[PDB]
Design a protein around this nucleic acid. Structure first.
Ligand SMILES: [Mg+2]
Ligand SMILES: [Mg+2]
Ligand SMILES: [Mg+2]
Ligand SMILES: [Mg+2]
Lengths: 159, 172, 58, 222, 185, 51
RNA sequence: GAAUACUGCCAGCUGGGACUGAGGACUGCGACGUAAGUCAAGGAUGCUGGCAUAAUGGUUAUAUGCCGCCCGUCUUGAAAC
RNA sequence: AAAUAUGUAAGAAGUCCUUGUUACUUAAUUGAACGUGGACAUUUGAAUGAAGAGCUUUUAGUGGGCCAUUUUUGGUAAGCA
């Protein structure tokens, strides 16, 4: 018969990395999580308590609850034709802060700094990001860089 | 396609801070238009150097016209092509009045005798042969003889009408 | 008399024909599953905040 | 004397001064285009004389024409064609060039022919097949008052202001382009020039980027 | 062919007219259609749309609800507008003097307002004396307090009322409603 | 009631774009360019003719 | 020192052919004219001829050109041997 | 250790500055959560589109499938499974 146990098909996803087994370094337990933080889920195979189900590996959620050794995370899950809200109780070994969110908060600070500086001088500071633009015109000098190249090569076996 | 032009295409890697002013690689490409010329340039730079269109730039494309279009020349042509079961190098000789016309004839001839499409052919080199006694192919040498002259027997005249009243002749 | 066992054919098309919808977040999410100690204290904190605001605005 | 001629005279005065403003704007546009063209040509000549190569600025505007019918399209290209507003064959739109739109075009290459349109192509396209989106309706432009009523808040007062905002990708390009209803082109009058359309332009087909030959194609298509 | 992004020929899904054949209701509708077209007051548009509503979509408005609304700061002198029925309420013992415009007044509601000193007004008189809905106050009754709504969304852990004819012990209070009998919901 | 194409029907062409009259009068579609005699560098010509 | 090809532009000019004529007082935007007006500018008018009836047209029978498998049903699939 | 496919974010329910509540927390006038009052301009924080956007009730038929490119299992294979 078939087999659909809780940890089926997790053979490689719950591996420790190569030469990275053993105890968890202390910065994992020294990190601070608050309600509203955006966190990524990556299960540590050495910690079997509070582990997430294999579906939530690589998912990113929002903290809604903080307990003694664990964090409640909200994940939107695809079920049928709509997303359902799922609440996971995960120990901190399986959770890391989202670097994306950290960089967004840095961008918010920089946007405020630019706006305040433009409030004094340089109006219209143009806060929005832009996609990569087509290149402007340019002049390519030949001095010391005379264009010189050959043609496609004949076939030969190398055997 | 067979109305070939010859382009010089000069390009380079996109300049960076570590290596400003890259080395401006240049090729001569036979193509029907500049779009195909630029594509062929990037295909060959792709194959020879560790560069691609995304990480590169085209600094110049220029059509190269024949110096003496009305001077009958002999062209040695080195090509590399893919057959149905391998890759082969060939040398051929074309008597023609321009490089683009000689390359046109080469593509027609490769398609005819080896069923090789434009897809399968690399033009390694096209070079005018400076003098006779260096022409190696008899199918070209036979046209270099002194006071060459030949008839055109069995002339067939095209009729503009369905019916003819005169039993046509083929004299010429 | 065997039949087809399973397939997900047409299932994504059916799911998308009325679209896939996100779960419509609200301000003030439900405090279900939140720590009982925190909720119990938060009730008195809100009570005091509302009392002080009423005593100020009047 | 029921107060008719007074406001008719005032309305004619307003129209006359508005047309004087349009006339001076169009003269300025014409001189700006002439200066840009000659400066580009002379910059190429000066780089040649100095021994350098003048790499012209990368193109900022593409015109995209859907050349494939609506049946049997994978979902991702179907979605991108919808977002580019190419919902039927021979529909055309203007797209300003960024990385975000170049990826879209690269994702819908097999179903479109696109390139870099000239001023002549843009002007003829807007003059003959230009329609505005007003209250979700397709309105023939046919008059400057329509354009000033729907895009005058961006400083666009006439069909030539609209064309200028398209050919030079201005600050209000997005608004002007979205105001333009997607152009509905006929099949090309001299055919497509190829036996089979659905190969790349480089491979003797019709789709993909054909940078400056989109002008010839679109001119025959409208 | 067109790659349609939306369903074609889709009706708006909103009533454009009353479903009824009440001729006096249709006269009120044509009056407020004229007002909604020739005035920029959004009151006329709101009243016009409410004139199309079904019975469950125009729940009755109690006089106690009116009095509570008139207790709002600065709303003591406004004209209460109910596009529907105003019912009587005996839970209240004091009623202010006020103007109420409504489609229908029950006998008790009308008597209570008149005794309080106010007046009951039809929507055409309201239109005459306030063509732009000046100093009006539109009130709506409780829509979701309908008995049918209790059964909407019935399911596990939803907390809704089952659709049932007889109530009491022996009627759906067993396996499925308590842990001692199988499971609970 | 009927869409009239500019690029024909010069009346509609003139209703739009009052500058078309100045364009036609001054023949701005046939503008003679100022002559210049700048010469390409010998390095450019040698690169162009190079094998 | 020119010419021409190729490519491109003109709010350059102009000849021939085909289909269409929706709307029905005026209102608009323009153009040409010192103005008065005029105009190809928010959709055809002017002039002329023949017939005034089976002539056009309708119906019907036939002929010709091309096309057209028997419906209903169950079925993944029916003209189904 | 790819390609393709896949999670999250790109702000007003936001950010910053003072100081209010608590029975939670801190050695603590420390925090946590939620707040009063003040500041942020129109590029309110990428692109494109947006055909109106959200919400609910109720009920039909269906629950034999099959084909093609590509990936792929059993089988010598199959218009096989
Ligand atoms: Mg089944
Ligand atoms: Mg033809
Ligand atoms: Mg037949
Ligand atoms: Mg069945």
């Amino acid at each position: 018969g078939k087999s659909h146990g809780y940890r089926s098909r997790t053979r490689y996803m719950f591996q420790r990395d190569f030469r990275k087994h053993g105890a968890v370094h202390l910065s994992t337990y020294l990190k601070v999580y608050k309600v509203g933080d955006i966190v990524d889920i990556k299960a540590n195979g050495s910690i079997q308590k509070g582990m997430p189900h294999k579906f939530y590996q690589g998912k990113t959620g929002v903290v809604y609850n903080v307990t003694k050794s664990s964090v409640g995370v909200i994940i939107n899950k695809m079920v049928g034709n709509r997303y359902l809200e799922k609440r996971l109780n995960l120990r901190v070994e399986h959770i890391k802060h989202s670097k994306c969110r950290q960089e967004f908060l840095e961008r918010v600070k920089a946007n405020a700094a630019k706006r305040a500086e433009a409030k004094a001088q340089g109006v219209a500071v143009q806060l929005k990001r832009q996609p990569a633009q087509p290149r402007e015109s340019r002049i390519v000098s030949t001095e010391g860089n005379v264009p010189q190249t050959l043609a496609p090569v004949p076939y030969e076996t190398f055997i | 396609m067979a109305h070939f032009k010859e382009y010089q295409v000069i390009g380079r890697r996109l300049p960076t801070e570590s290596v400003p002013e890259p080395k401006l690689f240049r090729m001569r490409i036979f193509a029907s238009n500049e779009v195909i010329a630029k594509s062929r340039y990037w295909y060959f730079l792709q194959k020879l150097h560790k560069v691609k269109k995304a990480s590169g730039e085209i600094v110049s494309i220029n059509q190269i016209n024949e110096a003496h279009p009305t001077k009958v020349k002999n062209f040695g042509v080195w090509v590399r092509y893919d057959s149905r079961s391998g890759t082969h190098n060939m040398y051929k000789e074309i008597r023609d009045v321009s490089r683009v016309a000689a390359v046109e004839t080469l593509y027609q001839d490769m398609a005819a005798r080896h069923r090789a499409r434009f897809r399968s052919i690399h033009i390694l080199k096209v070079a005018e042969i400076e003098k006779t006694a260096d022409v190696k192919r008899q199918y070209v040498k036979q046209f270099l003889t002194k006071d060459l002259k030949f008839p055109l027997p069995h002339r067939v005249q095209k009729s503009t009408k369905t019916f003819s009243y005169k039993r046509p002749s083929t004299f010429y | 008399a065997k039949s087809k066992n399973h397939t997900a054919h047409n299932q994504t098309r059916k799911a998308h024909r009325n679209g896939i919808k996100k779960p419509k977040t609200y301000k003030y999410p439900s405090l279900k599953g939140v720590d009982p100690k925190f909720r119990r204290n938060h009730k008195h904190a809100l009570h005091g905040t509302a009392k002080a605001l009423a005593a100020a605005k009047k | 004397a029921e107060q008719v001629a007074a406001e008719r005279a005032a309305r004619k005065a307003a129209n006359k001064e508005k047309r004087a403003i349009i006339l001076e704007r169009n003269a300025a546009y014409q001189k700006e285009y002439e200066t840009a063209e000659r400066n580009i040509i002379q910059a190429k000549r000066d780089a040649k004389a100095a021994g350098s190569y003048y790499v012209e600025a990368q193109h900022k505007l593409v015109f995209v024409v859907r050349i494939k019918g609506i049946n049997k399209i994978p979902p991702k290209p179907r979605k991108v064609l919808q977002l580019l507003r190419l919902t039927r064959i021979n529909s055309g739109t203007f797209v300003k060039v960024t990385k975000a739109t170049l990826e879209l075009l690269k994702l819908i290459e097999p179903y479109v022919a696109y390139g870099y349109p000239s001023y002549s192509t843009i002007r003829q396209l807007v003059y003959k097949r230009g329609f505005g989106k007003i209250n979700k309706q397709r309105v023939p432009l046919s008059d400057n008052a329509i354009i000033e009523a729907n895009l005058g808040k961006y400083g666009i007062l006439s069909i030539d202001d609209l064309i200028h905002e398209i050919i030079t990708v201005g600050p209000h390009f997005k608004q002007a382009n979205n105001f333009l209803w997607p152009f509905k082109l006929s099949n090309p009058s001299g055919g497509w020039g190829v036996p089979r359309k659905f190969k790349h332009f480089i491979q003797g087909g019709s789709f993909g980027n054909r940078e400056e030959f989109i002008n010839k194609l679109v001119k025959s298509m409208n | 062919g067109i790659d349609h992004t939306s369903k074609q020929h889709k009706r708006s899904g909103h009533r454009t007219a009353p479903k009824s054949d009440n001729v006096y209701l249709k006269l009120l509708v044509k009056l407020y259609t004229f007002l909604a077209r020739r005035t920029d007051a959004p009151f006329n548009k709101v009243v016009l749309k409410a004139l199309f509503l079904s019975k469950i979509n125009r729940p009755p408005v109690s006089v106690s609800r009116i009095a509570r609304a008139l207790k709002q700061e600065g709303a003591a002198n406004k004209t209460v507008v109910v596009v529907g029925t105003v019912t009587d309420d005996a839970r209240i013992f004091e009623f202010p003097k006020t103007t109420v415009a409504a489609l229908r007044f029950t006998a008790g509601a009308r008597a209570k307002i008149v005794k309080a000193g106010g007046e009951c007004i039809t929507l055409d008189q309201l239109a005459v004396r306030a063509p732009k809905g000046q100093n009006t106050l539109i009130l709506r009754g409780p829509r979701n307090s309908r008995e049918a709504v209790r059964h909407f969304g019935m399911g596990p852990h939803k907390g809704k009322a089952p659709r049932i004819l007889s109530t009491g012990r022996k009627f759906e209070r067993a396996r499925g409603r308590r842990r001692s009998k199988g499971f609970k919901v | 009631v009927l869409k009239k194409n500019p690029l024909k029907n010069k009346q509609v062409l003139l209703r739009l774009n009052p500058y078309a009259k100045v364009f036609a009068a001054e023949k701005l579609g046939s503008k003679k360019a100022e002559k210049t005699g700048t010469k390409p560098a010998a390095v450019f010509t040698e690169t162009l003719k190079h094998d």
